[PDB]
């Protein structure tokens, strides 16, 4: 099945998922000189005060922090979006070294990691219905650079030991995703896709300009995770990023001058 290796990694995905070569694939390189400022874009509204995290899971590709999405608790609105999008999960992509790891790039710069906060359009009633629609998902993407520690990440880092291998989960209640956000909400936006199989072309991407800082020690704990299951040969969970895909007939818009 799919992964990140030589034999099953991103260049192979199109055989099982032919949309991999589709018209609106993600991630992309953001060329900051050709993204146009769009004065018609609104400020993003991120309302995470009532977010209810439940659990953290090692799915064999990354780890997912899952939320209770059974009420409007944690929602994204505004910006480029019409209507209201509910937070369901977040996860990260990261590298084996600090010079790689992000999915999106900015003028071909790769960051050490990238955080994706995934939200679904409430007008389609559940996530599985939403991913079948071109406006079904909104993903907030946030870059990570290595420098100072991010205090709001440490609770996540703390628990990784308990979910080392594929299929392991742990209770993860009361985690506040506001502590993962940068100071500014300036962003780029474009229409794209999920960056893992099934690669569905259902996402409005909102990529924040300002990275968060995490410490080397924090990242190093992500790189001790395993893609394998318990009692299988160890293969470190690193380099779980899809490279940039062709922009094709799309425009990236900036919220800021």
Sign of CA dihedral 214, 64, 17, 97: positive
C-alpha 46/C-alpha 138 separation (Å) is 12
- How are beta strands 105-106 and 29-30 bridged, if at all? parallel
- Rg of the chain over Cα atoms, rounded to whole angstroms, equals 17
Q: Is the peptide bond before 198 cis (omega within 30 degrees of 0)?
A: yes
Does the annotation list 91 as a binding residue? yes
Instruction: Compute the residue count for the chain.
Output: 257
Does the annotation list 196 as a binding residue? yes
Q: Is the peptide bond before 27 cis (omega within 30 degrees of 0)?
A: yes
Does the annotation list 116 as a binding residue? yes
C-alpha 21/C-alpha 55 separation (Å) is 33
Q: Which domains does the chain have, with CATH numbers?
A: 1-257 (3.10.200.10)
42, 43, 52: which is closest to 74 by C-alpha?
Answer: 52
Any idea which residues carry the catalytic annotation? 61
């Amino acid at each position: 099945h799919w992964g990140y290796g030589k034999h099953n990694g991103p260049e192979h995905w199109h055989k099982d998922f032919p949309i991999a070569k589709g018209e609106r694939q993600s991630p992309v390189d953001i060329d900051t000189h050709t993204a146009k400022y769009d004065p018609s874009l609104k400020p993003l509204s991120v309302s995470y005060d009532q977010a209810t995290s439940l659990r953290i899971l090692n799915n064999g590709h990354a780890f997912n922090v899952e939320f209770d999405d059974s009420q409007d608790k944690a929602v994204l609105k505004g910006g480029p979006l019409d209507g209201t999008y509910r937070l369901i999960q977040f996860h990260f992509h990261w590298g084996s070294l600090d010079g790689q790891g992000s999915e999106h790039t900015v003028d071909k710069k790769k960051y050490a990691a990238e955080l994706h906060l995934v939200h679904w359009n409430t007008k389609y009633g559940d996530f599985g219905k939403a991913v079948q629609q071109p406006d079904g998902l909104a993903v907030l993407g946030i870059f990570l650079k290595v420098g100072s520690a991010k205090p709001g990440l440490q609770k996540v880092v703390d628990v990784l030991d308990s979910i080392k291998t594929k299929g392991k989960s742990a209770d993860f209640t009361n985690f506040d995703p506001r502590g993962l956000l940068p100071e500014s909400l300036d962003y780029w936006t474009y229409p794209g896709s999920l960056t893992t199989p099934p690669l569905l072309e259902c996402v409005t991407w909102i990529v924040l300009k300002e990275p968060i800082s995490v410490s080397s020690e924090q990242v190093l704990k992500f790189r001790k995770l395993n893609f394998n299951g318990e009692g299988e040969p160890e293969e470190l969970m690193v380099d779980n990023w899809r490279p940039a895909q062709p922009l094709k007939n799309r425009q990236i818009k900036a919220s800021f001058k």
